[PDB]
Design a protein around this ligand. Sequence first.
Ligand code: SAH
Lengths: 38, 70, 22, 50, 235
Amino acid sequence: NGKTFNQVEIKPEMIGHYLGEFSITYKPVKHSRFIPLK
Amino acid sequence: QLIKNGKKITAFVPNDGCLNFIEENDEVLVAGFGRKGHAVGDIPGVRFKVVKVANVSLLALYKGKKERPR
Amino acid sequence: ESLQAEVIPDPKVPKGTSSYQA
Amino acid sequence: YAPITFPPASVLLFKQKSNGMHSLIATGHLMSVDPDRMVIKRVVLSGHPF
Amino acid sequence: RRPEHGGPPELFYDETEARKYVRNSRMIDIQTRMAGRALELLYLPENKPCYLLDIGCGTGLSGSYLSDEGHYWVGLDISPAMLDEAVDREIEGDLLLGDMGQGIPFKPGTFDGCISISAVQWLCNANKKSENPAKRLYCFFASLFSVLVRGSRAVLQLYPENSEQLELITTQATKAGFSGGMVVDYPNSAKAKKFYLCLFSGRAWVLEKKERHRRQGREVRPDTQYTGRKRKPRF
RNA sequence: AGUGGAGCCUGCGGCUUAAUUUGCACCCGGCCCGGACACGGACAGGAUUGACAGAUUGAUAGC
Ligand SMILES: Nc1ncnc2c1ncn2[C@@H]1O[C@H](CSCC[C@H](N)C(=O)O)[C@@H](O)[C@H]1O
């Protein structure tokens, strides 16, 4: 995937898809008020 | 505190390196600062400078020419 | 008389899945 | 770490030689007796701005 | 350009304007959002059903927010059509068809807090000849100061068209007895420029000498890092 | 006439990231080579050069 290797089974229903779909190259994005006292 | 009259004065040391030769209860020879009884144009309210300590000059101690006893 | 106490007297992931893919 | 001594006191430092003689290395006065004085070891890391 | 510049607030906010007001999706969102910041900025007693005064309720948008928070309130409005559609929305708090500049008719020390969302910028423009902007603002602020329990904060969200507007509002408030300031949340941000008037009711010597000699016009050594530096200790 | 409202696209911030380059530059892995001078070591008992085949490797290769 650019950095590491991901191991995958080859299932019979995996027939129509590329190999690169099964190793995602990016990680998902996972992303206190003033009150005056005087 | 001066010996011959018991008066207290505040005396100047040429740098902080020379002050390490001075300890409490050392006999010190003191002169005036240099403008004839007037204080310093830089340090407010000091008129005296240390000349000798333990019968050796601060110039001889600061230049390694002589050592002082204790 | 003082005492000679110099010190204190008081005492779910598949096998081949990488950590990235996980 | 040393027993309390009230100043003034003179400070002689000696290093023991192999032949048994003590060689004099220092000279001075006992400044103070307090553990509140802290020593600060400093480490400098160096980097190259490539 | 501005709703305020149109003219008399009542004549501007007619039945047509009122219908379009509640139909506007932005109006709903921005007003509830501003009322949230208003109730937060004013430091109401925490975990306490408060008694606020809606100086500019209009459609009862800010009012409905206070009802949801459990804070009972009284509305005040110059637009009859807007108050009709506010009572058609069935808001919990009571309403009253009156003028802010004229004066709030409540016992001194009755409301613990006051919510005013976009309504005080209309008092700085004399729509009639008798209308006096300074006097109208002052009278309103003085009445509010008294009506409000001495100590409770009266948050006042405003939309100034210039500095003169803000200047007038602030002077007429500070001289009426209102103390505090103004919290401009997100001041640089323009779409979030929210002005809330929170108003509670209770070697250098050698350098100078060388410049002296330079102005006198004689030859002066060039100024370097060795200008004033002690050469040595002196014995 | 609009924009500021809504959906989409894009530019600066910010957030995630190995990198999301910057006022193919970025990231993850694998090759190639990198002084003489002085002094002290090993060196014809042998210093050192080239090499088939197999393998490691994402792949092959006396690198
Ligand atoms: N002098 C005055 N006296 C009373 N109400 C006034 C006034 N000048 C303006 N207003 C009111 O200011 C309002 C502007 S809109 C206020 C409603 C608020 N934005 C909300 O929806 O929560 C109008 O409803 C108008 O009646």
